[PDB]
């Protein structure tokens, strides 16, 4: 929020969280 | 082996008869068709219980076997007289007054869905028919020449119950697999055959009810290869619709037109997607893979169906067995034990 490949990483992680 | 097929046809009738008796009087929630799965073979080949297949292929095989069994037992064709009809293929030439007409028997109505939006529109396609012209012009056998001819299909005999297939399936050669179409389509609760019959076209051109009421909606939800089948069916009561899926029988609110659209009408919708622990909002166009497949229309206990032309034991015992076991595991029984032991 404050950085391109990280965008897919966060999206893939945001479904991985409990 | 004609003798084997005759017993095969009759055996299906006996197995199917049992199913009617059970659903009429079995006190359990649902029935497990042990014999029906074992007896029925699709086009002779055995039916795989773990394999998805087109319902029409099962439908076509079933309606034929019962008709054969009835004929083998001296009864007429119950379903063909009540559900089956007869097309009146008409060939009218424009350059010559020659007219060709022939009759074609059928079981269900197939209507184009990709190029039509409502069941009415796909139905004048039969009345309007097709025009053959140019190199495709129909070759008149009497004239021995090619002449423009309007080839149209009209219903000659009106069965008391009308079967309509909603063509939503085809094959994709690029994908090398069966594909499903979820095109938005329409159909009314009360449907009229009169403008679309032979008499109606003759009445309009200038030389026995025709109205039908929808009672059954077969719906598919899933992929063409797999998917699920379930029905929405009206109850003939003296004073409604119900939801039939597998072993479950419940009520439904699809009598409303909005729920009519959401479930059976199918089609596109601009769906809303909820994700990212309810922090990200997105809009995605979605296909209603749940949509109608086959429709049944009823016109507004026949002795002729009983007249010749050419068991309740399994029901009772499964009633008794269940209601014996239903009492064993009843919560009031366990409380009777607790009182009996602790008294």
Swiss-Prot record, chain A:
Q: Which residues form the signal peptide?
A: none
Tissue and organ expression note: Widely expressed in embryonic and adult tissues.
Q: Describe the family membership recorded for this protein in Swiss-Prot or TrEMBL.
A: Belongs to the peptidase C19 family.
What is the recorded name of this protein? Ubiquitin carboxyl-terminal hydrolase 9X
From what superkingdom does this record's organism come? Eukaryota
Annotated organism of origin: Homo sapiens
Functional summary from the UniProt entry: Deubiquitinase involved both in the processing of ubiquitin precursors and of ubiquitinated proteins. May therefore play an important regulatory role at the level of protein turnover by preventing degradation of proteins through the removal of conjugated ubiquitin. Specifically hydrolyzes 'Lys-11'-, followed by 'Lys-63'-, 'Lys-48'- and 'Lys-6'-linked polyubiquitins chains. Essential component of TGF-beta/BMP signaling cascade. Specifically deubiquitinates monoubiquitinated SMAD4, opposing the activity of E3 ubiquitin-protein ligase TRIM33. Deubiquitinates alkylation repair enzyme ALKBH3.
Miscellaneous remark of the record: Escapes X-inactivation.
Q: Assembly state and interactors? A: Interacts with SMAD4, MARK4, NUAK1 and BIRC5/survivin. Interacts with DCX. Interacts with OTUD4 and USP7; the interaction is direct.
Q: Which gene encodes it?
A: USP9X
Q: What is the disorder linked to it?
A: Intellectual developmental disorder, X-linked 99: A disorder characterized by significantly below average general intellectual functioning associated with impairments in adaptive behavior and manifested during the developmental period. Intellectual deficiency is the only primary symptom of non-syndromic X-linked forms, while syndromic forms present with associated physical, neurological and/or psychiatric manifestations.
Q: Give the induction annotation.
A: By growth factors.
Places the protein is found: Cytoplasm, Cytosol; Cell projection, Growth cone; Cytoplasm, Cytoskeleton, Cilium axoneme
From Swiss-Prot, chain B:
Mutagenesis / variant outcome for changing residue 98 to A? Strongly decreased deubiquitinase activity
Q: Name the domain of life.
A: Eukaryota
Q: Where in the cell is it found?
A: Cytoplasm, Cytosol; Cell projection, Growth cone; Cytoplasm, Cytoskeleton, Cilium axoneme
Indicate the impact reported for residue 96 to A.
Strongly decreased deubiquitinase activity
- Tell me which tissues or organs this protein is expressed in: Widely expressed in embryonic and adult tissues.
Q: Which residues hold Zn(2+)?
A: 96, 98, 140, 143
**Residue ranges occupied by any USP domain in the UniProt entry:** 1-300
Could you tell me what induces this protein? Answer: By growth factors.
Active site: which residues? Answer: 228
Instruction: Cite any additional comment in the entry.
Output: Escapes X-inactivation.
User: Which disease shows up in the entry for this protein?
Assistant: Intellectual developmental disorder, X-linked 99: A disorder characterized by significantly below average general intellectual functioning associated with impairments in adaptive behavior and manifested during the developmental period. Intellectual deficiency is the only primary symptom of non-syndromic X-linked forms, while syndromic forms present with associated physical, neurological and/or psychiatric manifestations. Intellectual developmental disorder, X-linked 99, syndromic, female-restricted: A form of intellectual disability, a disorder characterized by significantly below average general intellectual functioning, associated with impairments in adaptive behavior and manifested during the developmental period.
Family membership, please give it: Belongs to the peptidase C19 family.
Function, in words: Deubiquitinase involved both in the processing of ubiquitin precursors and of ubiquitinated proteins. May therefore play an important regulatory role at the level of protein turnover by preventing degradation of proteins through the removal of conjugated ubiquitin. Specifically hydrolyzes 'Lys-11'-, followed by 'Lys-63'-, 'Lys-48'- and 'Lys-6'-linked polyubiquitins chains. Essential component of TGF-beta/BMP signaling cascade. Specifically deubiquitinates monoubiquitinated SMAD4, opposing the activity of E3 ubiquitin-protein ligase TRIM33. Deubiquitinates alkylation repair enzyme ALKBH3.
Known partners and oligomeric status: Interacts with SMAD4, MARK4, NUAK1 and BIRC5/survivin. Interacts with DCX. Interacts with OTUD4 and USP7; the interaction is direct.
State what protein this is by name: Ubiquitin carboxyl-terminal hydrolase 9X
Organism field: Homo sapiens
């Amino acid at each position: 929020e404050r950085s391109h490949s990280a965008r897919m990483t966060l999206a893939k992680a945001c479904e991985l969280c409990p | 082996k004609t003798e084997d097929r005759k017993e095969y046809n009759i055996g299906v009738l006996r197995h199917l008869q049992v199913i009617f008796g059970h659903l009429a009087a079995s006190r359990l929630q649902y029935y497990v068709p042990r014999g029906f799965w074992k007896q029925f073979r699709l086009w002779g080949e055995p039916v795989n219980l773990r394999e998805q297949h087109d319902a029409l292929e099962f439908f076509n095989s079933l309606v034929d076997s019962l008709d054969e069994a009835l004929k083998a037992l001296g009864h007429p064709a119950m379903l063909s007289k009540v559900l089956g009809g007869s097309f009146a293929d008409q060939k009218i030439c424009q350059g010559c007054p020659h007219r060709y007409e022939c009759e074609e028997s059928f079981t269900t109505l197939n209507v184009d869905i990709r190029n039509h939006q409502n069941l009415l529109d796909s139905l004048e396609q039969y009345v309007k028919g097709d025009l053959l012209e140019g190199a495709n012009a129909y070759h008149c056998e009497k004239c021995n020449k090619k002449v423009d001819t309007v080839k149209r299909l009209l219903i000659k005999k009106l069965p008391p119950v009308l079967a309509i297939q909603l063509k939503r399936f085809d094959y994709d050669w690029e994908r090398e697999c069966a594909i499903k179409f979820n095109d938005y389509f329409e159909f009314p609760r009360e449907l009229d055959m009169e403008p679309y019959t032979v008499a109606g076209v003759a009445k309009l051109e200038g030389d026995g009810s025709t109205k039908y009421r929808l009672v059954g909606v077969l719906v598919h939800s899933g992929q063409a290869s797999g998917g699920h089948y379930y029905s929405y069916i009206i109850q003939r009561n003296g004073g409604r619709w119900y939801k039939f899926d597998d072993g479950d029988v419940t009520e439904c609110k699809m009598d409303d037109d909005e729920e009519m659209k959401n479930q059976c009408f199918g089609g596109e919708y601009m769906g809303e997607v909820f994700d990212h622990m309810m922090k990200r909002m997105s809009y995605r166009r979605q296909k209603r893979w749940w949509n109608a497949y086959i429709l049944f229309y009823e016109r507004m206990q026949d002795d002729e169906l009983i007249r010749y032309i050419s068991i309740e034991r399994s029901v009772r015992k499964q009633n008794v067995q269940f209601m014996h076991n239903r009492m064993q595991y009843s919560m009031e029984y366990f409380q009777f034990m607790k009182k009996l032991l602790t008294c």
